[PDB]
Amino acid sequence: MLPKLVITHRVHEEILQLLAPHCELITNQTDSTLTREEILRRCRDAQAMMAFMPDRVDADFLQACPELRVIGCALKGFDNFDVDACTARGVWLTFVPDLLTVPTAELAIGLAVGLGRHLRAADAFVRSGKFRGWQPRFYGTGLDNATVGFLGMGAIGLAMADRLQGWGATLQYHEAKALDTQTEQRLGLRQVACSELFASSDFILLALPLNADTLHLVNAELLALVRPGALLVNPCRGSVVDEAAVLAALERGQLGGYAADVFEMEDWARADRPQQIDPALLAHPNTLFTPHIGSAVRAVKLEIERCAAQNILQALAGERPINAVNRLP
Amino acid sequence: MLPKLVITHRVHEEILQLLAPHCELITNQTDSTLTREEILRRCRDAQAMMAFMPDRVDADFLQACPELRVIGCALKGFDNFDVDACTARGVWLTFVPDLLTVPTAELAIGLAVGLGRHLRAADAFVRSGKFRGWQPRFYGTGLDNATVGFLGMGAIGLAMADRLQGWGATLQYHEAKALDTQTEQRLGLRQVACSELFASSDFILLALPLNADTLHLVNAELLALVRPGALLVNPCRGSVVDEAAVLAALERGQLGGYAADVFEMEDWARADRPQQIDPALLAHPNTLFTPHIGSAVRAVKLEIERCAAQNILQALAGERPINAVNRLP
Ligand SMILES: NC(=O)c1ccc[n+]([C@@H]2O[C@H](COP(=O)([O-])OP(=O)(O)OC[C@H]3O[C@@H](n4cnc5c(N)ncnc54)[C@H](O)[C@@H]3O)[C@@H](O)[C@H]2O)c1
Ligand SMILES: NC(=O)c1ccc[n+]([C@@H]2O[C@H](COP(=O)([O-])OP(=O)(O)OC[C@H]3O[C@@H](n4cnc5c(N)ncnc54)[C@H](O)[C@@H]3O)[C@@H](O)[C@H]2O)c1
């Protein structure tokens, strides 16, 4: 008789124990992600859903789950969940606004450094047993005296700026909403126009959501403006960049490197989503890739899961979930 | 007749044009490093030597070079130069106290983050073409909430601590000489003893020089104290650790990982150094290596050459050189 909650991926033992009194659990305690079908099947008369990165919820989905009251997302960017369609069908949609920030900021910064210093080739060369003593090659680019620019200055943007405080860089940024003047002053951050951002940054760090307006914002037009050698890092969504324009920009040698933790192929809500990452991109030596491990820190997963849990519980208790993304009664 | 100066490695054109007006230069504007035998032959009657990391200067070297008045080092770690022997024969020995610090500090943080997040493997996974989007695995270790222990707290250790300022980590160190109270509380650094450092740190960042006191300091004994999963980062000298001990600790699962820019094989002065990095260590998944690129940033390399050149010039003009390592009666 208790509400039914479908949890699409493994969560911690302790999280289940927190949910179990209040709802019956349709869980997936394995490593794999299940087909769309199998998940739709489970959700038919499900009253709650814990959704993770590979899930996409559209109107067709919601349509076949008439009893849903809350979809609790263990994530920040809800771009593959049609918020409106949720609101239309009376479904609460919740996110995790803070817990993913830091491990992701930490990673973005490591990518910057990894890319600026040719960490892949350097590591491969040492491993191939060919390294036999100090040599004047592998010249790299560090952050000291570099100008670093951010596209976006929300949670992840500020966590990055914070961590770059002691590093001797000129920090500058472009965003939709300006930062208050106190914060700018504190973090040594200068508000520039988007094209100046691309024209004058030695490192470009991406920190914005994927939505209608950001889709492919970082395109050939913007990449054309960059200092030869400029370094681009994408910790957020594959589709805010045009991967092909990024590839063309590396090939001509204008853009010095592209590191990324996210890919256009992950962005389900897009009708023309690439099925894979272009092999020519994987093959380009001036790159660095991680398979969406932005928040793949063990202690954090437990918290993220819990945040999503608590939200779900509140919804099912008839309260406004503390982290709803959308608005209802 | 102009004092004769032997440069053992390629230097920037600009550095030749500063030196040549004071000295007759015996240069090596090739890509190679030269034989000990060849360098001795050149130094037979030189009054100065500009030296780099492949150079090693013992008593027999000085004995074969009676005219030598200064050896100017394009580096910070003089472990391959016998200073007392230098002092004894009236030979200044200078070095470069700051130019190398920051690029090396940036690298070490990068290796820390890189190693913690399993970056080598992550990038392999993506590049293999079988990335199918996010998964509940690959999981790693962040700096937020971790304890980070430094062994050494001079130029480099401070730069690392500087660069960790906004990172949510508890910072500790053990040095041969304590930091002053102000710098301590400015950076949030607690002094602890060596063994306690290794027992209670999630990351251990090496930041000390190579000498008889520190040779093989990081040995089986010390490594047996670490929390399982602890991460070691060596950006200073290979031989401050026992690489076989490091390997064994990795192989038994106690040490979480090892990352280094330096290796026992490069430590020329060491009669018994291994001749290569152990293939079992290069094959170990829990590592990350860079081939001594600590200061491989072009803008900086020119500066390093300039620092040594000026030091060399001051000596020949009979001043005490600003960055002397010894002092002359
Ligand atoms: N790698 C990962 O695992 C991971 C983790 C967390 C978040 N992310 C992604 O990163 C995105 C942002 O993260 P956040 O926590 O900083 O989000 P946030 O909401 O805190 O910040 C979004 C920022 O981007 C700016 N922005 C929005 N639209 C813009 C536009 N058209 N032009 C310029 N700037 C614009 C906003 O003004 C805001 O500053 C998330 O939406 C998510 O998609 C990825
Ligand atoms: N990979 C590279 O390119 C690179 C670059 C610069 C320096 N290095 C190496 O790093 C070393 C240190 O660099 P630095 O600029 O910080 O030098 P530094 O002289 O400023 O710092 C040395 C620090 O180590 C501490 N120390 C010395 N003996 C110790 C012991 N027995 N136990 C604990 N602590 C001890 C000292 O007290 C001091 O704090 C250099 O000697 C050099 O060999 C490597």
Numbering used by the authors:
A (entry chain A), B (entry chain B): 1 to 329
Quote the passages of the study that discuss this structure, keeping the authors' original sentences:
Phosphite dehydrogenase (PTDH), first discovered in Pseudomonas stutzeri WM88, catalyzes the oxidation of phosphite to phosphate, which is coupled to the reduction of NAD+ to NADH. The enzyme follows an ordered kinetic mechanism with NAD+ binding before phosphite. The crystal structure of 17X-PTDH indicates that Arg301 is situated at the dimer interface, but its side chain orients inwards towards the enzyme active site. As such, Arg301 is in position to directly affect catalysis, through either electrostatic interactions if it is in the guanidinium form, or by acting as a catalytic base to deprotonate a water molecule if the guanidine is deprotonated.
In addition, X-ray crystal structures of R301A and R301K were obtained. Crystals were obtained that contained NAD+ and that diffracted to 2.35 Å and 2.65 Å for the R301A and R301K mutants, respectively. Unfortunately, the side chain of Lys301 exhibits poor electron density in the latter mutant indicating that the Lys does not occupy a well-defined position in the crystal. Although the R301K mutant possesses slightly higher activity than the parent enzyme, amine bases failed to affect the activity of the R301A mutant. Attempts to co-crystallize the PTDH mutants with sulfite inhibitor and NAD+ were unsuccessful.
